[PDB]
């Protein structure tokens, strides 16, 4: 009954915002998100399905991740417009349905329900923010058209629009590719990533956090349902990781560089799609969501509009704990021992090798080695000379959130044998 | 095509235009109030066919020049005459429009025939509404070709047909 | 929308040009343009006899004209020291308030017609015609009557005048009360 | 069928060619309304009757009416302004335009299907229990989506 | 069309031509009779002139309409300016054959109606949208924004209350469960006069039909008395004739539909004569609407949109919900008699305060 | 089968538009053509596979209406003050 | 249901109506003096600029139309429940009522914020 919490609290707050103050609106949104998250925890191993709505380990874990990201990004946003929060709630539900169904058409409905509110969330009026909103909207509507044609060819291959169909020859491959088009577009896979640099630079930094965590989480959750062939997977991974890291080297701004880095990270994530392990991918995306939320909370505390690399430097002198947490996040996202990013990457690489894809894995790893250049040029900068730099050192709220994120990351890096046991049915 | 080239045809179209004459308002001065009184609920110009009143000039054939035509109003009315479709007639209502009337000065055109071809003249100050009805009955027999002047001449159906507008 | 609500259009009574600055359905501000009716009474009157100007006075406010006639008459009377007989002055105030009623009748007809329905223009206006009959009985003219004079009035009231007047003063109040 | 099938498909294709080719936006929009009317007629020919009528009512009656409303409020009829033409972008994209057909054509090429089912006409009398029923959960999700889109657009404009 | 027969195509074309020319002559003579009725209302009497009783003046009016220099305005669109009136007339003339004038064969053997589509109300809705289409299209093509804003008012108001039309037409279907007109009419034959069951929605339908060009939004708009409307102000010979023709066709189409759907479509409990009762109810609603034409003021289309949007349409959808409760639970139908009677007594007794 | 090839052709045409159209609204119209071509394919496969695609296409139309409303709001937001909706004047965000 | 023959009769209705309309247009066009004037083709109202120099018209109509597309989608969903209801029972009524209530909640939002704008 997590859907119950989401729908009820959202619809109620819709009207309640007229008589209730934005502070109360914030507290109520927090309570709704927290109650949905608690319900998700209490339903561990308790599948609850009505129609296309199907709650399994995938839906459970990934929507937990989305709820965590939503909670964090709501904690930080302080603008005097209540609306700027309600939409997030909406988005949450949509992304839930993205993981909680195999029904392609309901998948499309949830995809739209999640893509819309972020568009308005990217409207800080910032000239680059509005440019990002328009680019994102047009490309998303195109990707939705592609996903719809894929569901059409799916229905051509089978009498139902629910995934799991037997599948024909070229028709089923074409439908799968057309679905994969929109799904990877939302997953920042090349050659469908092009929105990501513009959007991550232009969108307000907290919205960038929320997107890069929840949208990608739910997108991969639904991706596990797809029957992705190895060859298309090989091409997507190759292009995604290559373009991501290589273009990331040339970036001088934090947000866009991190966007290309997220392209690379999604390329790494895509390995579980070889086997659909749904355990390796769950762990990977857990680590990535935590580290991303931490780093982007730092970026948001610095400046929502734009944060260059040089401004990031010297953060340790500014804030020691925050700089250490950002560095630890950079390392975990590099895929280094003994941090959980390495465990997620290893799990994905193992699923890939079990699938028998060799040269793709080799190229992915070489490109991951490339990534260390900028990952270090940013992570280590924490210690550099302080330049004049916007620094609003947050409330203890965001400090504790960052602390818990980093501790969870490192703990699961040393002891992945704790949560990784409970990503399957949930013993 | 101009309502000509058969004895039955032109008589019939003249019938149609004559009894279907639709006035186009041109309110200038106190002539306009007694113009209106030709429509009130003692005396309506609503029987001959002029009940409805299309204020738009693209939709009315009869133009009632009602009031003193001040000179700054001339091109406007000028354009209004050209901004009427070609089957158009112009009635000169009141003294101030037909002649300079008692306002014989720099400010008033001394005859609206200067800018637009006057079809019918009707003096009075103000002309009783029934006098306007008689003017339009005269115009009725005019567009039918049933009208003659004092010299014996049989007036043409439509004035503004003899002018090189420009 | 710098819109040109032109002279006489759209059916804007009192021919007048308006340059309405406006965005949408509000009305920001109207820049007027008048003079499309300038007749030049103030000049022509300097070239007509004092007796003759009483012909010029009503044709200006052609709704409430007799107030113009009376104002000019009073100014001249003061100027040369004339005496208005009390019966003559009484008849003058009668004509004044009667033209006032005619003005208000046409005013409400034009207003109610201007926005809303076309019906209310007729009924009151009928009474106006009736009122004119009264004038037609005394002045022999619909309006623009050349009746008043410096010393007084043109000529006498007909014997048939008062009964029509009493008939209208009895029927009118119930009419006005029903409209109210 | 084939007599009207070929003609209807030609009308559809020419309308699409116009709506993607015409630079007079109004002309493209009305060509597209012709497209949707012929499309609803074809829907009827496909025993799917309800959907065609809703297509005409919703898309034509409501949506592209709003398209025309915007482009008359915001002139925007002739897009040929502020070019930055990028000449090479015209053919290559156009080339890509053809390619996305062929593979789809390939996916449909060499395909035969069982077009024999007793639809009994696509009347909503039978569509209800699917809509309200198997699709009822999808229905509530779609309605919530519509409400969310309303609020998003409102807060998006929301001058204050 | 489960049980309703089909005439050959040539008879369908014959009746189609007859319905076109009948609506033509009908709106012409209705212009006449409305002029005379307005006159009867505004004391002033009508044309005992060129008629004699007036019934030949419209021919002179038509002969005036032709020869009136159908003008192609320069600096305005060559094509759409001409095109829009054709749209407004074509998509208006049709959708009148559906209105049943009698039981099958009561056209001396063949068909009272022309076509009896399974989805009739949807056909009416669709063809209603295209009238507004032509209206505001002509408003644009004129290239005089004076009329542009008027056509915009037209489209805004008519589309608002046309939305209300859907929530209005929802309610009866739950009771009927069929979308063929003749079935609903026979329903009102046996059970009796559906408005007795569904009074409130009828109002928001009537108001819609009064908002949809009858009168009193009066921001329809017509050029007179306001910022001039669309669909006129630039057409001379036949195109303005086409616009007026289509507007009056919509007038009589609604004036015929209102008795057709809610009240007793012809099908009277008494004497069951096919055509005369339907024509007479058409005339009745026409006279009431003309009474309103003469008797009520404007609505400014902003307060009008607020009124339709915040009050009418919520009422219609709520009434749909209540009728849905009754139908899905299906226990009584007398509940509906009681409920609508209460509703009408509410909307009536609330006046004399 | 002609219906499905027609859906493919109409989708290709809508893509031709989205690539070609300079103005946001004409792009949006091309997208509408794309979605309706997809819905035509859905109706064909529903006639084949049993009528489910009808409700599918209905939901598609609803979703399209929602995203169209929001996209029109955004388009107004950017090019109410700004000049022609042409996207080429939006290039600040670069790699 | 209904036989397809009635729909072809509908198409014939439309075809004859269209042909007659185009004929009426031709009648209107052929019968005329046909003496255009440069001022006759002028837009309106005294020289130029009836409206002329004006900026874009209000968005209120856009708001109404966007509202209308969404709410007509609503009514499109509500009609299938309008036809087949008793067979859908309390389950169908409950689904349709929750649907209408969600969309009317959105409407209540737009109302309490209001669009006079
Ligand atoms: C349904 C309604 C219709 C079909 C028509 O609109 C109605 C029948 C037409 C009418 C009433 C005529 C209008 C003419 C007019 C507006 C003249 C200008 C004018 N009008 C005045 O008001 C009377 C004046 O007095 C202050 C003036 O000085 C002046 C110069
Ligand atoms: S002729 Fe007399 S009534 Fe007419 S405008 Fe002149 S002064 Fe007025």
Numbering used by the authors:
A (entry chain N): 1 to 427
B (entry chain 6): 16 to 181
C (entry chain 4): 26 to 205
D (entry chain J): 1 to 160
E (entry chain H): 2 to 354
F (entry chain K): 1 to 95
G (entry chain A): 1 to 117
The paper states:
Aureothin, pyridaben and piericidin A are the most potent inhibitors of T. thermophilus complex I, while rotenone is less effective than it is with mammalian enzyme. All Q-like ligands studied here display a similar pattern of interactions at the deepest end of the Q-cavity, with the headgroup about 12 Å away from cluster N2. Piericidin A shows similar interactions with the addition of a hydrogen bond between Q2268 and the distal carbonyl group of its tail. Most dramatic changes are caused by DQ binding, whilst Q-like inhibitors alter complex I conformation consistently in a similar way but to a lesser degree, to states intermediate between CXIINT and CXIDQ. The overlap analysis (OA) (technique described below) shows that transitions from CXIINT structure to CXIAUT and CXIPYR involve relatively minor PA rotation component (mode 8), which is much stronger for CXIPIE structure and is accompanied in addition by a bending motion (mode 7) for CXIDQ structure.
Complex I (NADH:ubiquinone (UQ) oxidoreductase) is the first and the largest enzyme of the respiratory chain, catalysing the transfer of two electrons from NADH to UQ, coupled to the translocation of four protons across the bacterial or inner mitochondrial membrane. In bacterial complex I the 14 “core” subunits, necessary and sufficient for complex I function, are shared equally between the peripheral and membrane arms, together forming an L-shaped molecule. All known co-factors of complex I reside in the PA: the primary electron acceptor flavin-mononucleotide (FMN) is connected by the redox chain of seven Fe–S clusters to the quinone-binding site (Q-site) at the interface with the membrane domain.
